[PDB]
């Protein structure tokens, strides 16, 4: 069963939101996928932000919209054809 990512951080100096998370070292290359969904005024589906990247960050500027809605994030990990469960993140409202 594949390891689940940890320490899901959301950061934004100015209006440039980027997600950062932690992962362990593996003999193979862990490739992550990041999803973001807004809620409040609207109730969108989970939309991909960064698909299969190697690094521990993901800029989500182009997924921010309507400061009234809060954003929530989740990230999973892949190694081969197996995937990890989602690391659900806490809420994000204002910069």
């Amino acid at each position, epitope marked *: 069963s594949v390891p689940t990512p940890t320490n899901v951080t959301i950061e934004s100096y100015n209006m440039n939101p980027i997600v950062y998370w932690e992962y362990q070292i593996m003999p193979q290359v862990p490739v992550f996928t990041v999803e973001v969904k807004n*809620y409040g005024v609207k109730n969108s589906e989970w939309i991909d932000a960064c698909i299969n990247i190697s690094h521990h960050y993901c800029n989500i500027s182009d997924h921010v919209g309507d400061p009234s809605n809060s954003l929530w994030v989740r990230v999973k990990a892949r190694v081969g054809q197996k995937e990890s469960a989602y690391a659900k993140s806490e809420e994000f409202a204002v910069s």
Partner: antibody
Amino acid sequence: AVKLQESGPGILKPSQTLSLTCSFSGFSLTTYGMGVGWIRQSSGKGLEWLAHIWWDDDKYYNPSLKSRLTISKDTSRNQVFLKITSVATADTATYYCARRAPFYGNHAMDYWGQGTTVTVSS
Amino acid sequence: SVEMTQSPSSFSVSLGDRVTITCKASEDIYNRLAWYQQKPGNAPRLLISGATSLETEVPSRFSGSGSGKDYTLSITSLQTEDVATYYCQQYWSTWTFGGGTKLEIKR
């Protein structure tokens, strides 16, 4: 008083297109955060969410049916419309349209129309 | 998509009983749950929103609860006016209804 009513063709043939109308009063779809959606239900079956439209013309469709649905709104007439192409017999059901409860973080459907039953047959 | 399992489709109960209906969501829907009651040949009536908020007019014998993926509806004293089908609904990511649970009475 907030009311909603669905109008439909009654009986319609296969392969055609279905024109559904949701006429409402009591509120405005121009007001920020307002929205209306469709839900269908066949005899002794559950409820199936079809589509939803927002005050800003942002539209949401149920993936399983996206390709056959088109939802639009006309504030100057206070009606929301739904179009369903390639009409099949499975589609025989009762159609409802309902609004989004006007409270932040709430998207439960508070007011519903009585619904209109459409039978798909030749 | 998110799935909502309501088991079962029906439940044999007697008036006066306390009834709990179970609704399970495939992933955390963060308490964005609604509950609807529907008597034959009528549009569904919204009972509860936000997992625990009763709509006005709804009798106090009704209550909802749960969290994460597990939510339930409880009626403390079943009365005829309560015999209907009950549907739960997730409104966190667009909308999904549960299969429904129809109350039937024992005899």
